[PDB]
RNA sequence: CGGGCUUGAGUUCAGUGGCGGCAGGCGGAAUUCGUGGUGUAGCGGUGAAAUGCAUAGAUAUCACGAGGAACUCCGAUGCGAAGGCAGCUUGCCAUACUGCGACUGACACUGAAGCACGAAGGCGUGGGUAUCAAACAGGAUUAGAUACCCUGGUAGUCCACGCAGUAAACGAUGAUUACUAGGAGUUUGCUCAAGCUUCACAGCGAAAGCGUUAAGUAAUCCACCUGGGGAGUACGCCGGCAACGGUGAAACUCAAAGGAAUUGACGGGGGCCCGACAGCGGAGGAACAUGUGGUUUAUUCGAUGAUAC
RNA sequence: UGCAUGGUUGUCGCAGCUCGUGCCGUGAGGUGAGCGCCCACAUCGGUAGUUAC
């Protein structure tokens, strides 16, 4: 319950979810 | 005598004539005030008393000035015969 | 291995239930549109405004016609394996709790694989389409505003069938069995037994705390962990229309990353008190005097936010 | 060399600064005695009289 523990997990999910959108409609 | 009020404006309609705070002159942070509602009620009552008809109230919305409008309408010309509340949502549309 | 027993387990019977599931009907309030009475200077919105609707006739107000979505009060409690379940009524199902002097006789617990169900959002085909509303458009505030505020607005939100299989899917606490103290309430079956939540012995714990609904004392089986990043990543394999889901490394890198509490400091977090926030005259504009800073030539040295000049 | 000092000074701008007991906590910690006046100006009442009245 420090709070900073969940910030790293939230941040890497953003990179992963954004990296897939760059090539989603890109055949 | 139908008084339609809200958090922003109060208007009154008698039927024949109508009045509102915006028509009376108040623009912002004053339409929902006791002065503007009574002024609009007096503006409508000036023609209401000079109409040959002498009524029931149909206040619909919640706002600050319904009492002032009712009192002014009763004082000028005719008197408020009955203030029957018609304020109307049994879990209806999502806001 | 061969018999027995009824206490565990199950079957039957009676009583008591219930926002449990599926399906068919019925409803009023609000609200949307279309067509007509009355009527005219605005309405709407905001901290203030504007974009918007409106005299080729608004807001408001009275009717008729066509529709979609959600169920105020009761209402905090109850049910379900979980996800979840709330207008009224009916049908068909399932299930629970309590007891019987009815039955059978250990028929039990757990469970890797597998299978079933599984919020919201999302996908495919066909319907429907009132409100709200991603994306998008315009108006504001800001140095900027790709946001917060306002006005519009398409998917979606609704229904049927089929995919998908995820969540802070949480009590962050797996299932079963037996035992161990008290107080305050509450529901049902009648002082008793089930259930439902907060203070609290022993005990447990690092502490916060848990404490008969244990995180106490014990037994059985399953799931999972072995420092932090890299990383739930890469490769391969399985599944899916797609979105994606499942299984799941290594190279390299660091001496930390963490939990609970204590004292300060801070808060565009609150509370309680006590003084800065009506009058008068100056400075900032001019000329001189004076002290500094700067440049020049030797311009001695020091004092430099309030608290130097 | 005031960033090695003594002694002095300006600010913080001030109402809370210490000494003992017990008790609570695994711990870091929490919670009977000492301390917060002076000078001048006003009124009146007794003594002094010069280079003062
Ligand atoms: K406790
Ligand atoms: K598709």
XYZ file of C-alpha atoms (C1' of nucleotides) and ligand atoms in Angstrom:
486
model
C 0.000 0.000 0.000
C 2.941 2.317 -0.597
C 1.408 3.272 -3.942
C 4.639 3.441 -5.926
C 4.531 -0.354 -6.304
C 1.504 -0.135 -8.613
C 2.937 2.790 -10.603
C 5.586 0.615 -12.266
C 3.000 -2.027 -13.180
C 0.667 0.636 -14.593
C 3.474 2.228 -16.606
C 4.695 -0.949 -18.312
C 1.122 -1.893 -19.243
C 0.912 1.446 -21.063
C 4.053 0.712 -23.103
C 2.818 -2.790 -23.952
C -0.685 -1.671 -24.938
C 0.653 1.248 -26.995
C 3.258 -0.871 -28.804
C 0.580 -3.218 -30.161
C -1.607 -0.404 -31.524
C 1.193 0.881 -33.776
C 0.958 -2.292 -35.904
C -2.685 -3.324 -35.408
C -4.126 -2.106 -38.716
C -0.588 -2.064 -40.171
C -0.491 -5.157 -42.370
C -50.637 30.424 -13.180
C -47.676 28.158 -13.970
C -44.249 28.958 -12.514
C -41.415 27.065 -14.213
C -38.245 27.435 -12.150
C -34.798 25.854 -12.208
C -31.293 26.385 -10.854
C -30.672 29.082 -13.488
C -33.929 30.894 -14.309
C -37.532 31.402 -13.202
C -40.347 32.089 -15.680
C -44.082 32.568 -15.112
C -46.976 32.026 -17.527
C -50.613 32.982 -16.930
C -53.436 31.851 -19.209
C -52.507 35.245 -21.893
C -49.213 36.649 -20.622
C -45.788 35.575 -19.421
C -42.669 36.969 -17.779
C -39.134 35.937 -16.877
C -36.078 37.188 -15.019
C -34.115 37.489 -18.258
C -36.902 39.605 -19.724
C -36.986 41.711 -16.548
C -33.252 42.396 -16.789
C -31.354 40.045 -14.486
C -28.753 38.052 -16.418
C -26.398 35.997 -14.221
C -26.261 35.102 -10.508
C -29.473 37.127 -10.076
C -32.197 35.236 -11.978
C -32.371 32.724 -9.107
C -32.831 35.488 -6.527
C -35.910 36.678 -4.612
C -35.846 40.136 -6.222
C -35.962 39.027 -9.868
C -38.798 36.543 -9.332
C -40.968 39.168 -7.627
C -40.127 41.697 -10.354
C -41.174 39.252 -13.085
C -44.319 38.398 -11.123
C -45.173 42.107 -10.916
C -44.492 42.518 -14.642
C -46.929 39.704 -15.429
C -49.462 40.817 -12.804
C -49.663 44.322 -14.283
C -51.447 42.710 -17.242
C -53.038 39.896 -15.203
C -55.088 42.287 -13.063
C -55.949 44.303 -16.191
C -57.381 41.239 -17.935
C -60.810 40.536 -16.414
C -59.699 37.193 -14.940
C -59.224 36.658 -11.206
C -55.750 31.660 -9.578
C -54.315 28.197 -8.983
C -50.529 27.821 -8.936
C -48.613 25.148 -10.856
C -45.049 25.581 -9.590
C -42.945 22.964 -11.373
C -39.226 23.440 -10.765
C -37.119 23.973 -7.653
C -35.618 27.443 -7.321
C -35.198 30.486 -5.109
C -38.071 32.873 -5.770
C -41.226 30.785 -6.103
C -42.515 32.173 -2.800
C -41.727 35.738 -3.885
C -43.506 35.265 -7.218
C -46.564 33.724 -5.539
C -46.697 36.520 -2.954
C -46.382 39.239 -5.605
C -49.077 37.629 -7.771
C -51.397 37.404 -4.758
C -50.678 40.997 -3.732
C -51.209 42.501 -7.187
C -54.776 42.110 -8.432
C -56.092 38.569 -7.979
C -55.129 36.333 -5.052
C -53.499 32.902 -5.136
C -56.493 30.586 -4.742
C -54.446 27.404 -4.257
C -50.749 26.562 -4.630
C -50.910 22.962 -5.853
C -47.396 21.610 -6.350
C -46.788 19.863 -9.677
C -43.060 19.264 -9.213
C -42.243 16.197 -11.402
C -38.957 10.501 -12.354
C -39.496 6.956 -11.072
C -36.015 5.769 -12.140
C -36.284 7.072 -15.688
C -33.535 8.224 -18.040
C -29.850 8.292 -17.171
C -28.615 11.890 -16.590
C -10.647 -60.563 2.861
C -15.430 -62.067 5.363
C -19.374 -60.138 8.302
C -21.877 -56.287 11.774
C -23.412 -50.901 14.043
C -25.502 -45.963 13.368
C -23.470 -41.247 15.240
C -20.934 -39.474 9.330
C -23.237 -39.496 4.389
C -27.520 -40.049 1.536
C -33.199 -41.175 0.462
C -38.382 -40.299 2.087
C -42.114 -37.308 4.910
C -43.901 -32.690 7.289
C -43.192 -27.568 8.270
C -40.823 -22.786 6.838
C -38.886 -19.874 3.124
C -36.505 -16.716 -0.503
C -34.019 -9.122 -5.095
C -32.242 -18.028 -6.859
C -32.855 -19.525 -12.648
C -35.784 -19.667 -17.255
C -40.189 -18.225 -19.969
C -45.033 -15.709 -21.040
C -48.251 -11.491 -19.960
C -49.587 -6.447 -17.409
C -48.293 -1.517 -15.698
C -47.687 4.353 -13.977
C -44.096 8.460 -13.530
C -40.427 10.835 -16.380
C -38.703 11.599 -21.195
C -38.279 11.747 -27.275
C -40.527 12.857 -31.992
C -44.715 14.227 -35.335
C -49.398 17.114 -35.871
C -52.614 20.837 -34.137
C -54.897 25.411 -29.710
C -52.769 30.072 -26.436
C -48.930 33.357 -26.726
C -44.376 36.444 -27.810
C -38.352 38.502 -26.423
C -35.998 35.402 -25.285
C -34.263 30.425 -23.977
C -30.068 27.561 -22.542
C -25.406 27.426 -20.162
C -21.344 29.341 -16.779
C -16.941 31.242 -11.592
C -17.954 35.003 -15.912
C -19.072 34.054 -20.930
C -19.515 32.097 -25.744
C -20.502 28.276 -29.359
C -26.053 26.721 -30.015
C -32.269 26.918 -30.515
C -35.687 31.381 -31.642
C -40.425 36.775 -35.319
C -40.345 32.361 -43.077
C -42.402 32.235 -35.464
C -38.842 30.037 -29.646
C -38.944 28.884 -24.076
C -43.363 28.019 -21.750
C -48.401 25.930 -21.963
C -53.076 22.665 -23.582
C -54.208 18.498 -26.381
C -54.045 14.046 -30.135
C -50.847 10.301 -32.671
C -46.106 7.040 -32.988
C -42.384 4.945 -30.054
C -37.622 3.351 -26.817
C -35.253 2.783 -22.130
C -35.285 2.447 -16.693
C -38.148 0.490 -12.406
C -39.100 6.275 -6.922
C -41.212 5.199 -1.880
C -40.604 0.154 0.561
C -34.839 -0.327 1.010
C -31.312 -2.065 5.165
C -32.291 -7.247 4.635
C -32.308 -11.816 1.913
C -30.744 -15.471 -1.957
C -26.972 -17.741 -5.238
C -20.845 -22.077 -6.384
C -18.943 -17.566 -8.042
C -19.954 -13.722 -11.672
C -24.452 -11.669 -9.763
C -29.953 -11.050 -8.384
C -35.010 -5.348 -6.919
C -41.954 -2.559 -10.858
C -46.678 -6.322 -10.674
C -48.330 -11.248 -11.840
C -48.398 -16.385 -13.645
C -46.175 -21.046 -15.266
C -42.051 -24.491 -15.190
C -37.592 -25.656 -12.522
C -33.762 -25.792 -8.881
C -32.284 -25.142 -3.872
C -31.886 -24.139 1.375
C -33.127 -24.601 6.820
C -35.527 -27.268 10.725
C -37.340 -31.592 12.516
C -39.287 -37.722 12.022
C -38.573 -42.437 15.955
C -39.451 -43.863 8.117
C -35.237 -46.204 5.202
C -29.926 -47.876 3.445
C -25.630 -49.048 5.920
C -19.172 -45.699 5.664
C -21.992 -45.504 0.424
C -17.065 -40.175 3.042
C -13.214 -35.705 2.018
C -10.197 -33.510 -1.532
C -8.956 -33.449 -6.385
C -3.434 -32.797 -11.096
C -5.786 -33.534 -16.242
C -10.779 -32.295 -18.329
C -15.658 -30.048 -18.486
C -19.372 -26.159 -17.204
C -20.572 -21.273 -15.706
C -18.176 -16.665 -15.677
C -19.081 -8.193 -14.500
C -17.956 -4.378 -17.839
C -15.806 -3.387 -22.400
C -15.099 -5.924 -27.381
C -16.408 -9.137 -32.188
C -20.154 -11.564 -36.142
C -25.504 -11.947 -38.332
C -30.538 -9.981 -37.927
C -33.837 -6.395 -35.353
C -34.519 -1.836 -32.814
C -32.893 2.942 -31.631
C -35.742 7.427 -26.364
C -31.641 8.926 -22.800
C -26.537 9.014 -21.997
C -22.143 8.974 -24.568
C -15.769 7.018 -26.335
C -13.973 8.863 -31.306
C -15.163 13.446 -33.815
C -16.847 19.170 -34.225
C -17.387 23.909 -32.202
C -17.097 27.472 -27.790
C -14.324 28.910 -23.245
C -9.686 28.989 -19.385
C -4.433 29.038 -19.938
C 2.244 30.584 -22.134
C 0.338 26.330 -24.557
C -4.886 22.795 -23.254
C -4.160 17.217 -28.011
C -7.764 17.860 -20.712
C -10.792 19.384 -16.632
C -16.171 23.413 -17.914
C -20.291 24.249 -21.958
C -23.027 22.979 -26.636
C -23.625 19.013 -30.442
C -22.561 14.099 -31.633
C -21.412 8.203 -34.209
C -20.258 3.450 -32.424
C -21.882 1.497 -27.956
C -25.638 1.365 -24.199
C -31.389 -2.403 -25.549
C -33.224 -7.611 -27.832
C -32.179 -12.798 -30.128
C -28.347 -16.349 -31.455
C -23.175 -17.239 -31.580
C -17.744 -15.935 -30.158
C -14.459 -14.249 -26.607
C -12.672 -16.004 -21.196
C -10.585 -11.039 -18.663
C -11.062 -7.635 -13.477
C -8.833 -4.236 -6.928
C -13.422 -11.674 -10.661
C -11.173 -8.802 -2.967
C -12.740 -11.018 2.867
C -6.189 -8.874 -1.416
C -7.720 -14.721 3.621
C -8.931 -22.497 -0.975
C -12.052 -26.957 0.620
C -13.445 -30.348 4.726
C -13.649 -31.993 9.992
C -13.281 -31.507 15.488
C -12.472 -28.226 19.818
C -11.757 -23.252 22.785
C -14.101 -16.739 26.771
C -17.224 -12.815 27.302
C -20.305 -7.979 25.959
C -23.651 -4.866 22.041
C -27.416 -5.508 18.058
C -30.206 -7.974 14.065
C -33.424 -11.907 10.823
C -35.976 -16.625 10.716
C -37.553 -20.917 12.837
C -39.095 -21.239 18.918
C -35.938 -19.395 26.560
C -33.179 -22.625 22.272
C -30.917 -23.364 17.416
C -29.516 -21.707 12.743
C -27.540 -17.174 10.004
C -26.091 -11.929 9.690
C -21.750 -7.421 11.812
C -18.347 -4.655 15.502
C -15.589 -4.225 20.865
C -13.211 -8.217 22.635
C -10.008 -13.725 27.198
C -6.571 -17.371 26.140
C -3.746 -17.782 22.048
C -1.519 -16.067 17.430
C 1.281 -11.936 14.878
C 6.851 -7.976 12.915
C 3.036 -4.643 13.827
C -1.576 -2.875 12.175
C -4.456 -6.336 14.037
C -7.503 -11.700 14.060
C -10.188 -13.674 17.872
C -16.243 -19.408 17.665
C -17.780 -16.382 10.417
C -9.767 -17.042 13.761
C -5.235 -14.821 11.119
C -6.206 -19.751 17.936
C -5.451 -25.603 18.703
C -5.051 -29.996 15.561
C -5.720 -33.772 11.018
C -6.525 -34.784 5.080
C -5.907 -33.209 -0.010
C -5.192 -29.377 -3.797
C -3.085 -24.444 -5.666
C 1.140 -21.140 -5.252
C 6.330 -18.495 -3.472
C 12.095 -18.583 -3.163
C 15.839 -10.734 -4.022
C 14.525 -6.217 -7.662
C 14.597 -4.942 -13.015
C 14.811 -7.387 -17.922
C 9.379 -9.503 -18.094
C 4.483 -11.753 -18.105
C 9.050 -9.764 -22.662
C 11.263 -12.949 -26.891
C 10.926 -17.848 -29.474
C 7.992 -22.121 -30.141
C 3.147 -24.478 -29.391
C -2.444 -24.450 -28.451
C -7.077 -21.564 -28.927
C -9.907 -17.213 -31.487
C -13.210 -13.951 -37.438
C -10.340 -10.163 -35.193
C -9.243 -7.930 -30.473
C -6.348 -11.019 -27.896
C -6.019 -15.275 -24.246
C -3.039 -19.638 -22.335
C 2.049 -21.925 -21.609
C 6.495 -19.343 -20.643
C 13.010 -18.124 -21.054
C 17.817 -16.231 -21.416
C 21.671 -12.491 -22.106
C 22.619 -8.140 -19.326
C 22.118 -5.098 -14.810
C 21.708 -3.380 -9.096
C 22.450 -3.822 -3.636
C 18.820 -3.113 -2.857
C 13.566 -3.486 -3.845
C 9.733 -4.225 0.235
C 5.909 -4.503 5.137
C 4.039 -2.262 9.735
C 4.609 1.431 13.006
C 7.514 6.295 15.534
C 9.324 11.675 15.782
C 9.587 15.824 12.842
C 8.558 18.845 8.317
C 4.912 20.011 4.716
C -0.455 20.250 2.568
C -3.831 24.849 -3.019
C -7.025 18.884 4.616
C -10.229 20.472 8.336
C -11.049 22.847 13.724
C -10.063 26.601 17.852
C -8.227 31.312 19.236
C -5.291 36.024 18.974
C -3.176 40.499 15.513
C -2.964 42.169 8.822
C -7.264 43.862 6.047
C -11.776 52.789 7.697
C -8.404 58.438 7.665
C -4.006 61.545 7.033
C 0.911 62.716 4.809
C 4.730 61.109 1.670
C 7.949 58.143 -2.328
C 7.517 56.751 -7.795
C 7.779 62.899 -12.091
C 11.975 68.008 -11.559
C 16.756 70.329 -9.489
C 20.368 69.466 -5.919
C 22.792 66.685 -1.471
C 24.313 61.861 -0.023
C 25.297 56.147 -0.129
C 25.873 52.192 -3.293
C 26.101 49.245 -8.180
C 28.450 49.747 -13.116
C 32.609 51.762 -16.425
C 37.174 54.709 -16.373
C 42.110 55.655 -13.790
C 44.865 55.430 -7.970
C 39.419 55.777 -7.459
C 42.043 52.043 0.066
C 38.923 48.303 2.875
C 34.439 46.406 4.608
C 28.525 46.188 4.915
C 24.904 43.173 -0.277
C 15.862 39.672 0.485
C 13.461 40.882 4.535
C 17.800 41.891 8.774
C 23.347 46.355 2.864
C 22.614 51.016 0.268
C 41.109 32.758 7.339
C 34.027 35.648 11.037
C 33.402 28.075 7.458
C 38.889 27.760 13.693
C 37.297 31.793 18.170
C 36.113 35.308 22.800
C 33.288 39.411 23.649
C 29.463 42.477 21.555
C 24.855 43.138 17.522
C 20.561 42.326 14.172
C 16.619 38.815 13.005
C 13.596 34.574 13.854
C 8.806 37.417 17.237
C 8.365 34.398 20.151
C 4.197 31.315 25.620
C 5.967 27.082 26.897
C 11.577 26.041 28.945
C 13.759 22.107 32.551
C 14.392 18.568 37.019
C 12.280 13.505 39.469
C 8.251 8.964 40.160
C 4.953 5.537 38.179
C 2.605 3.410 34.064
C 2.000 1.903 28.516
C 5.203 -0.190 24.170
C 9.657 -5.895 21.642
C 11.386 -1.307 20.246
C 12.053 3.811 17.817
C 8.836 6.190 21.502
C 3.790 8.287 24.853
C 2.486 10.482 29.312
C 5.425 16.582 42.342
C 9.248 21.087 42.030
C 12.443 26.353 39.606
C 10.735 30.370 35.947
C 7.350 34.140 33.249
C 9.947 44.107 37.318
C 12.067 49.128 37.006
C 12.643 54.702 35.331
C 10.027 59.245 33.770
C 5.350 62.153 33.412
C -0.257 64.071 36.870
C -2.538 65.563 41.373
C -1.344 67.255 47.175
C 1.649 67.478 51.802
C 6.208 68.552 55.036
C 11.133 70.538 55.215
C 15.862 74.780 51.651
C 16.477 79.758 50.262
C 21.449 81.695 46.203
C 23.974 84.131 40.987
C 16.274 81.608 41.385
C 11.236 84.388 42.460
K -9.966 -5.656 17.492
K -14.407 -8.785 -36.546
